[PDB]
Design a protein around this motif. Structure first.
Motif, PDB file in Angstrom:
ATOM      1  N   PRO A 197      12.255  47.116  14.540  1.00  0.00           N
ATOM      2  CA  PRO A 197      11.830  46.190  13.485  1.00  0.00           C
ATOM      3  C   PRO A 197      12.839  45.100  13.110  1.00  0.00           C
ATOM      4  N   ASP A 198      14.132  45.361  13.301  1.00  0.00           N
ATOM      5  CA  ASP A 198      15.144  44.355  12.978  1.00  0.00           C
ATOM      6  C   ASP A 198      15.380  43.414  14.162  1.00  0.00           C
ATOM      7  N   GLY A 199      14.872  43.800  15.331  1.00  0.00           N
ATOM      8  CA  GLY A 199      15.033  42.978  16.518  1.00  0.00           C
ATOM      9  C   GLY A 199      15.883  43.617  17.601  1.00  0.00           C
ATOM     10  N   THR A 200      16.600  44.683  17.253  1.00  0.00           N
ATOM     11  CA  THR A 200      17.452  45.381  18.209  1.00  0.00           C
ATOM     12  C   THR A 200      16.627  45.881  19.403  1.00  0.00           C
ATOM     13  N   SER A 201      16.831  45.264  20.559  1.00  0.00           N
ATOM     14  CA  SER A 201      16.101  45.649  21.759  1.00  0.00           C
ATOM     15  C   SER A 201      16.531  47.038  22.236  1.00  0.00           C
ATOM     16  N   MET A 202      15.618  47.744  22.901  1.00  0.00           N
ATOM     17  CA  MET A 202      15.896  49.081  23.422  1.00  0.00           C
ATOM     18  C   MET A 202      15.788  49.127  24.953  1.00  0.00           C
ATOM     19  N   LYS A 203      16.677  49.898  25.580  1.00  0.00           N
ATOM     20  CA  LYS A 203      16.697  50.056  27.038  1.00  0.00           C
ATOM     21  C   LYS A 203      16.157  51.451  27.379  1.00  0.00           C
ATOM     22  N   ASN A 204      15.903  51.704  28.663  1.00  0.00           N
ATOM     23  CA  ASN A 204      15.361  52.993  29.111  1.00  0.00           C
ATOM     24  C   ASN A 204      16.322  54.191  29.049  1.00  0.00           C
ATOM     25  N   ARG A 205      17.380  54.089  28.246  1.00  0.00           N
ATOM     26  CA  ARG A 205      18.334  55.189  28.121  1.00  0.00           C
ATOM     27  C   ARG A 205      18.874  55.407  26.712  1.00  0.00           C
ATOM     28  N   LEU A 206      19.360  56.622  26.477  1.00  0.00           N
ATOM     29  CA  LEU A 206      19.904  57.013  25.186  1.00  0.00           C
ATOM     30  C   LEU A 206      21.099  56.142  24.812  1.00  0.00           C
ATOM     31  N   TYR A 207      21.031  55.510  23.638  1.00  0.00           N
ATOM     32  CA  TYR A 207      22.114  54.655  23.136  1.00  0.00           C
ATOM     33  C   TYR A 207      22.669  55.167  21.801  1.00  0.00           C
TER      34      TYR A 207
ATOM     35  N   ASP B  87      12.381  57.837  14.515  1.00  0.00           N
ATOM     36  CA  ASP B  87      10.961  58.109  14.386  1.00  0.00           C
ATOM     37  C   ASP B  87      10.315  56.930  13.660  1.00  0.00           C
ATOM     38  N   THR B  88       9.046  56.710  13.952  1.00  0.00           N
ATOM     39  CA  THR B  88       8.288  55.617  13.363  1.00  0.00           C
ATOM     40  C   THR B  88       8.244  55.672  11.838  1.00  0.00           C
ATOM     41  N   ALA B  89       8.098  56.873  11.279  1.00  0.00           N
ATOM     42  CA  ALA B  89       8.044  57.036   9.828  1.00  0.00           C
ATOM     43  C   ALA B  89       9.274  56.473   9.132  1.00  0.00           C
ATOM     44  N   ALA B  90      10.424  56.480   9.819  1.00  0.00           N
ATOM     45  CA  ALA B  90      11.684  55.974   9.237  1.00  0.00           C
ATOM     46  C   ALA B  90      11.632  54.457   9.213  1.00  0.00           C
ATOM     47  N   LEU B  91      11.037  53.876  10.248  1.00  0.00           N
ATOM     48  CA  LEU B  91      10.894  52.435  10.294  1.00  0.00           C
ATOM     49  C   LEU B  91       9.984  52.032   9.133  1.00  0.00           C
ATOM     50  N   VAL B  92       8.966  52.843   8.859  1.00  0.00           N
ATOM     51  CA  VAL B  92       8.049  52.536   7.766  1.00  0.00           C
ATOM     52  C   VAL B  92       8.795  52.653   6.447  1.00  0.00           C
ATOM     53  N   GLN B  93       9.599  53.712   6.337  1.00  0.00           N
ATOM     54  CA  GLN B  93      10.382  53.981   5.134  1.00  0.00           C
ATOM     55  C   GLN B  93      11.315  52.822   4.771  1.00  0.00           C
ATOM     56  N   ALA B  94      11.969  52.260   5.786  1.00  0.00           N
ATOM     57  CA  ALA B  94      12.901  51.154   5.599  1.00  0.00           C
ATOM     58  C   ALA B  94      12.148  49.862   5.281  1.00  0.00           C
ATOM     59  N   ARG B  95      11.110  49.578   6.063  1.00  0.00           N
ATOM     60  CA  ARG B  95      10.307  48.382   5.868  1.00  0.00           C
ATOM     61  C   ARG B  95       9.862  48.216   4.414  1.00  0.00           C
TER      62      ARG B  95
END
Lengths: 321, 321
Positions: A197-207, B87-95
């Motif tokens: 939601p903030d714009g931080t893009s995600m890659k196919n691996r744990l970050y 988790d999606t619910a956290a994104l909702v919580q922050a939004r």
């Protein structure tokens, strides 16, 4: 409500820091002093989260025969379910032939404590007589084996407990649960979306942004713990053993000090299993129960932090079964 | 507890059966006769489950300004989360700047009813004053567009409700929840494992044994419905509106007759939104409320079945805020 039964499991295959020095720019010291981890378990090639979950419940059954009797619900706290659907809880329900509703709960590392709270509510509201709460993770399946930062941190595991009505005086006394998704960029692994939601893009691996995650754990673990003990109607001196998420020894260390505590009143095993996420606390409780550090009547504190961001803590007066 | 607020949303882009004919071995007639679906909505390329959830919550706020006030928890029922963590619910919580704990609930199509029940439990057990329970699904992100037998069955969408204390005589009167994980091979979509416990190899995308999921659906729908009605201490005649999961007009029509109900008493929106999984019921409910089909004091029946296999049903006396 309280914990009527407990069991846990770790895969058979071990992986020493040496095993990591054999192919990655890292030493045993780098690891032992930066994380405190010496070894961790890794799931067999065809062994997944559901299997770890099945095995944890079998252990629960070996230690507590007939414990699934009366269980109307299975909640699997995990972040690495076998499939988007069916959920892993449904697979566990089937395996043990239970008449029960089932679902997976995703809330990061704190998922198991979250599940305990949810189980508590279910029992207390009368929607379930007993609830099988499982904490199970197969991180070795989404971990980038090459990434120095991650690779050495996570271990696979499974834990489980049955939550139900316990005798007067025993059981759960408090729960402190929370989240903060604005810190979603600090720890993640996409699934269906390529960015946050903030714009931080995600890659196919744990970050992971370890530095901030460290700052978080330390402060959260501490506040939550006191809040919980306080909400429970006790004081630190009333707590027989503190059982924290086993993510990092420095973090556990740093949090204990901040509480005026001796290592004897703190559970540790991150050294032997690494960070097993949701299975972390149940794996630790099992050892404490078996060593006799936890006994019917003791006040135990559970606390965890993780992706979300999410954090949780609970105070449970052991036993009363 | 009862439902204090309600909101829902469906993406703008419409996909007609003709849009499918424009590139698939199928006809409008085959689609409409087999499922009743004439249209469905598809999320924008930059719109995911979290976004559908935000929109649903935004609608809810527009209808009930100040409804998140007192919300201590966010539960997002979905099977297409943006990520495994956060988790999606956290994104909702922050939004929405909520001070609350959050988690995603995975239980197939019945997920939202499952969330209502967990929410009801958190409220009654005192772990939450109010809970934001969302049902959002961006199935378009995981669907195989070239699969004539699945690509035409789903739609994207979101729905949400706030659960909290309602005046005496209103709120949930009963919940019926269940699972049969042995039906895992009947409907699935892998996430971390390439095979299901029973050995059923999973393809890369969504698979669905349509004949079975149908028989099961009409079957459990009635049984669960009748059980929920009885459990609430009422009889079918006392229900003002039946709101079933929107997957197939035939299943719906089949179940409808089984209970001897005229269409006026069934909420249907499958023909315009397709099967929107967990978002299905809140959407249908929102429209029923706006069309004046449901009012304060009416007894409403919610019933869903899906992947797991999973099934749920509830009876709710509308209003009470």
């Amino acid at each position: 409500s309280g914990i009527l039964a407990l069991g846990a499991y770790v895969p058979e295959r071990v992986m020493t820091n040496a095993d990591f020095e054999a192919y990655l720019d890292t030493s045993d010291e780098w690891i032992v002093t930066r994380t405190g981890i010496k070894e961790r378990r890794v799931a067999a090639e065809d062994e997944y989260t559901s299997d770890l979950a099945f095995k944890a419940v079998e252990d629960l059954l070996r230690r507590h025969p007939g414990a699934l009797e009366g269980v109307d619900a299975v909640i699997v706290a995990t972040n690495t379910p076998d499939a988007l659907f069916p959920d892993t809880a449904a697979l566990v329900q089937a395996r043990f032939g239970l008449k029960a509703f089932a679902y997976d709960l995703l809330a990061g590392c704190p998922g198991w404590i979250y599940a305990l709270a949810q189980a508590h509510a279910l029992v207390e509201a009368g929607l379930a007589q007993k609830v099988l709460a499982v904490g199970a993770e197969a991180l070795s399946k989404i971990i980038d084996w090459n990434d120095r930062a991650t690779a050495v941190l996570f271990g696979d595991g499974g834990g489980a407990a049955v939550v139900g009505k316990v005798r007067e005086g025993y059981g759960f006394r408090s729960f402190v649960l929370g989240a903060d998704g604005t810190g979603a960029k600090e720890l993640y692994h996409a699934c269906v979306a390529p960015r946050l939601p903030d714009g931080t893009s995600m890659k196919n691996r744990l970050y992971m942004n370890g530095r901030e995650v460290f700052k978080f754990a330390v402060r959260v673990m501490n506040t939550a713990t006191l809040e919980a003990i306080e909400k429970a109607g006790l004081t630190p001196e009333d707590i027989r053993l503190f059982v924290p998420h086993q993510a990092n020894l420095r973090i556990i260390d740093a949090a204990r000090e901040r509480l005026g505590l001796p290592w004897e009143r703190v559970a540790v095993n991150v050294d032997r299993y690494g960070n097993t996420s949701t299975a972390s606390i149940p794996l630790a409780l099992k050892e404490a129960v078996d060593a006799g550090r936890i006994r019917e009547g003791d006040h135990v504190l559970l606390v965890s932090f993780g992706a979300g961001l999410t954090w949780a803590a609970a105070v449970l007066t052991w036993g009363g079964a």
